[PDB]
């Protein structure tokens with residue numbers, strides 16, 4: 001129907017917005033600590049600690065399959081990346097500190113993304 005099409009146009013423009021956001025978020029991770037899933041070969045007991053792993057590559061796959069219906073779902077995954085890291089890694093590690101910096105810098109991007117989502121009405 002025309003309705004389904006209109007909906008899909010909105011999802012596509014949401015996806016376009018979120019792709020930009022993801023690219024900006026990933027720029028705040030120059031070391032690329034969060035670029036890929038934690039390796040179960042290098043950390044074989046990771047899943048004993050973290051029940052819902054997340055990383056930027058995994059987000060990008062969901063993103064490109066238009067799997068984020070709204071900004072909230074996207075933010076959920078971004079928060080997983082940060083929160084998983086700050087539990088698994090101790091406070092005085094380069095890993096924990098990278099997540100803190102990513103959280104803080106990312107918040108600026110996500111704050112304006114929320115306004116753009118609401119203003120354009122993409123949800």
Ligand SMILES: CC(=O)NC1CCN(Cc2ccccc2)CC1
Pocket residue numbers: 033034038039042043084085088089095
């Ligand atoms: C996102 C996140 O938490 N990434 C990593 C942080 C620390 N590394 C340490 C490490 C390196 C090499 C072998 C075994 C463990 C494991 C996972």
